[PDB]
A paper describes a structure:
In the same sample that produced reconstructions of MukBEF bound to MatP-matS, we also observed particles with disengaged heads and that were neither DNA nor MatP bound. Although the map was resolved to only 6.8 Å, which prevented determination of the nucleotide state, it was very similar to exploratory reconstructions of nucleotide-free MukBEF. Hence, we refer to it as the “apo state. The apo complex is comparable in size and shape to apo yeast condensin, with arms fully juxtaposed. The apo clamp is more flexible because it is not held in place by ATP and DNA, but clear density was observed at lower contour levels that allowed unambiguous positioning of MukEF. The apo form, however, lacks both MatP and DNA and therefore represents the result of a completed unloading reaction. In the apo state, the heads disengage and tilt, and the joints and larynx become closely juxtaposed. The hinge follows the tilting κ-MukB neck during DNA unloading, and the hinge-proximal arm changes from a straightened conformation to a strongly curved one. Intriguingly, the neck gate is open by a narrow cleft along the interface in the MatP/DNA-bound structure but is closed in the apo structure. The minimum backbone Van-der-Waals (VDW) distance is 2.8 Å across the interface in the MatP/DNA-bound state, which is reduced to 0.1-Å minimum backbone VDW distance in the apo structure.
Author numbering:
A (entry chain A): 1286 to 1334
B (entry chain B): 1236 to 1468
C (entry chain A): 1434 to 1468
D (entry chain E): 9 to 213
E (entry chain F): 9 to 206
F (entry chain C): 10 to 22, 119 to 440
G (entry chain D): 22 to 115
H (entry chain B): 2 to 247
Amino acid sequence: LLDVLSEQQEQHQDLFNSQRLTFSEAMAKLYQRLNPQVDMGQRLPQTIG
Amino acid sequence: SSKSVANIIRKTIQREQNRIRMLNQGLQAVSFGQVRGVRLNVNVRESHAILLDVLSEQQEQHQDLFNSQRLTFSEAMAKLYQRLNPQVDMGQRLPQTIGEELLDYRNYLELDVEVNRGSDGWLKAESGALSTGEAIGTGMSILVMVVQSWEEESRRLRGKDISPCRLLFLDQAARLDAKSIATLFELCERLQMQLIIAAPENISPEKGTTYKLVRKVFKNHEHVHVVGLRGFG
Amino acid sequence: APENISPEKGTTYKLVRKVFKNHEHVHVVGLRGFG
Amino acid sequence: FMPVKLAQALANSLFPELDSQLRAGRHIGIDDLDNHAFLMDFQEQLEEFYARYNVELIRAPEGFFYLRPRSTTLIPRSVLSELDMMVGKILCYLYLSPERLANQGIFTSQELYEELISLADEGKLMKFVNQRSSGSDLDKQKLQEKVRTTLNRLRRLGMVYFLPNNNNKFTITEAVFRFGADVRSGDDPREIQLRMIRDGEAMPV
Amino acid sequence: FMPVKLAQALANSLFPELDSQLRAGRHIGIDDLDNHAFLMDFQEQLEEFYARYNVELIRAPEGFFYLRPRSTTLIPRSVLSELDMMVGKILCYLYLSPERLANQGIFTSQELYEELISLADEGKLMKFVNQRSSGSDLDKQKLQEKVRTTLNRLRRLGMVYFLPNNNNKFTITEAVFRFGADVRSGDDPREIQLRMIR
Amino acid sequence: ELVSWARKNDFSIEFSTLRLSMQLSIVANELHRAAEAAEEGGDEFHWHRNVFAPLKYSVAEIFDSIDMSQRLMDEQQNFVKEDIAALLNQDWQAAIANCEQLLSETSGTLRELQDTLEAAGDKLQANLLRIQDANMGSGGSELVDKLVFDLQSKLDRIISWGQQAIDLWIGYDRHVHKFIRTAIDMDKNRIFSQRLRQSVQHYFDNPWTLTVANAERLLDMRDEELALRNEEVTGELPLELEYEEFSEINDQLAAMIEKALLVYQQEQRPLDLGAVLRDYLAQHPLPRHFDVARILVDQAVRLGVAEADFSGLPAEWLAINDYGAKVQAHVIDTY
Amino acid sequence: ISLPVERLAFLMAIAVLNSERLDGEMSEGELIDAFREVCKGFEQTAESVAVRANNAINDMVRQKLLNRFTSELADGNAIYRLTPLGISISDYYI
Amino acid sequence: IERGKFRSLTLVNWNGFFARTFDLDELVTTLSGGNGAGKSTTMAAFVTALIPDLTLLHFRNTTEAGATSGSRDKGLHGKLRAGVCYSTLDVINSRHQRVVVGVRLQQVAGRDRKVDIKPFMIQGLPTAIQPTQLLTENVGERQARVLPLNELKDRLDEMEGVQFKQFNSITDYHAQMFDLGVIPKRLRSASDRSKFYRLIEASLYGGISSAITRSLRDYLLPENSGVRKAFQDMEAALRENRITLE
């Protein structure tokens, strides 16, 4: 995620630029887009972000 | 189908309630501490009674939730349980699992023990209010009631010439008080019941046989030395 | 500890809860100099 | 590469049970359900698919299906025994016989042996379990145990299923009608047998 | 729907015979050039296709393909009998290094028979034929017949390739290592294989 | 026990649901009357004449009559099963419509019977619970409990069968159902049946056995059969079991100390831990002293408590032996 | 109608068990044990327990004394019940 | 009537126990010891002998439960040492017949922690013959060996009158035990075994502690498949509704 943040978030703006969700939610949705196999404890993406 | 599921669940619950209130009878006045009697209480849990009512009479009114492609049948059940009765609202344990639990009729019943504690009457035998030995005696009473039923049922098939062997267990007997331990012993022997009891300290020195176990490390392995004990000091 | 460990070394205090004149109480006998 | 329906059938969750157990000599009926409940949907597709392995999924006018390998069969061939055909015909009669419908399809090895010995000839039958038998009750018990073992082997080959809690009681597949291959039509049993061996369905042992 | 490449593989004209042999239990080594290449190309789909049968299409480190049945194998399993197991270990022990000094890859039923008799304990030989027998010629003939039967049974599984005549002389395929222990660098094949046979 | 009873005895040799409805009405009335009388709670004789004699026999007889109606429904469902079987034997194909109609009407009869049963069971169960509550109006009413006990299961049992039968019937129906599409549609003219019978009677003259691909199902490596962990283990066999009086290594002296402090309890004598510890420890060597002290304290403190503890004045670290051992203790005064 | 001593005894035994039965239903797994107990207390062994029990249960069913109901889940995969005739015989003495 | 009585328990080659024998009291037998004395191991060994159904056996202790008590293997494999081991109970029948039931346990090979269990029973054994002596052979000075099932069969068959039986199934094991008045209920079905094990394991823990209260429902209330079938019918109807909608 850190490497993508460094160099490839610009492919992920679609997730970023969506009024549906907030910035921390955007980070959570990105991270779960990464390492997709990794589930979380079914918690709010707000908290995950 | 939803109405039928609700009806069968309710019939099963009522039959089980009858059976448990039935089995309650036939209990002698055990003397575990201040507990002078034991009884079983079975009732329908309101949180699930409301859900049953919604299923039986108001299935269609939340079909939106059920036809939700995003929700599995157990997840749909869990989400409905969240919608009505929202005081149980819980989603950290996955909705699938809570719905699956909800697919067990037995969970729908509260199934508890009441104790005739002193002269206070029948009080719910909550572990935070009863002396731990009293609670252990209550659990033993439940177990012996069950095994009494087992033996009585098979009374016909078995010839009276044989009275079946009886043996139960009790770990951490140090929880109990002398009153509870004595009541357990008197109940067991009255029922010709054999017991195997364990405690860190020898809480039963004057009754039965006693062994003490000590574990020693020896050349990278372990051995247990067993020593007998005798009824005085 | 609940007395199932209580070694020789150090100031060993024996806390024993009792009701003294209806007052919840814990008597404390001290031991030291051992070891 | 494949027709839509054939790929559909091959994609069905039940398909692997069907294919594997048919390769293992099990046969299609009311029991053996996982291999039947959808093969009723794609009989032609599965038959043309199996022709590639030089084998045919054959349905008689009966609703049962069963596998037959060609002479050039890619999956190697084998056959059963006379007593197997015998128990099979008795089972087929049980399956058809409405009088035992109250049995609801559940039948016991003792019922099977009773019906078998009632319809058949005890001694001429017993000649094949052991050639030397001459009415010895030891050979009768041998025949009963052989009936049990043949019932087991038919269970392995999709004619019967033991109940989960009972090996003495069992339920019958419609693949049992395979045994009526010489009686599925009014033609002579021997000429039909010739047509089966021609279509490799049966051979004398 | 179905994966398109899986449809391509199953529609392949080589699919029928390969599938039939795999159902039989026959392994597919590097020697089967067409089958081996087809397997290498379409393993990604054939593994799923056979796992649908709860059977794993395993490529050994030796490269040969075979169907490992799970416990839940939808193709009911048959197994190599006890004499089949020990004759298979004897076959691997006839394929390992030392055979290069004795048979150069072409072996005869006499070689396997002699190795079985000399190496295997008499107790297990009697277990194979019968516990009460003792060295008698007829018991040896029965053991030899069982040896021939298990040899043909291994032939059906593509583990031994017969030389095309009624005489019982043959070569052994690399897949025979499923019988033997896994070879490690610096390990003596004789020592490990004898320890396993012992 | 009853086996010998019989052995030595030597003895040997209305489905109309309206009946069910009137029986249910009678049961409801009588049960309410008996529950009412039990709630009245008269004397022992009144208790009997209101809750055993009328209740026991009346409820037993009418439960048995209701079960008799259930058994009549059982015999009737059996009858329709044998009648369907026989009709299939005579009409074969032509019996399909008759069999289906018989299944439909039997299902309807069973459904109406189940509805008639459930129509009163719940309220009757409530009545029985009322009787159970009232039964505690007299200590000698234990026998009534047994009836109040028994009659519940019977009722439940009735209801149970009320459902169970349908659960069976609906299953049986499907079998019959499948039969029509698994026996007759393939043998529309029945010829297969007689031809199969004849072939069975004369099989060997058509010697044929079916051909399958059953040469091998799936040959595979055999398991590593029964290869288990083992070491031919040996171990030092236990000697004759030694005995010790409940950790007598500590508990002989626990008895000694509990006696020597029970004296202080018995005389309520003020206990100075410092002085008692000092007087005592002399009887034992230094390495044991700590083991001693705990044992003494665990005894001494249980006896009463120190009153000076509440004066706000801390106790001092009185020495009790050489080598530097000390004890902080107020004099125990209040037992 | 025909009730040998052993059969009539088995009948009272089944009746008593039913009177004790939780749900009144009698699985064949219990009928076999009841038959074993009654023959044991009568002490006769002509053949296996299974064959004799099978013959006896079939005899009472055909004699319109028992009603049989196939049920795969039931223990022994079958259930049995008293017919009204059997009821009227058992109660005549009990 | 004189109820049958358990006499003694013999644990052979168990974790910490090589050939130990505890003589059970007529009414009350007590075990004592500090941390990790292994009492739970003794209780587990007994119950394993009583119900050798490997599936039901899962021994989270009453306190300090879970794997750390040595139960990630279900408390069977690791609570045993490697190799042949025994768990046997002598019972004096109400008919006054001595019978030694028992089970031979063995650690299964590989990384797995499964246990191979074989039930068996002995009758006619002389009252003097202690199972510890019967199950062990004195090889080496004062450090006896433990002998496998085949050697036990040889040794017992060499003894007159004694009859040694092995059960191919736990069901016949329990049937014979019941026929000897060892069991109150005929556990004809695995469900009966499940409820039996529920009762013994709850008693082992004792009281209405969290586990006992949680599983009281299972202990008292039988499972009903009617609810399950009804739920599945609802599920199928819902699925087909969704299909039609789409």
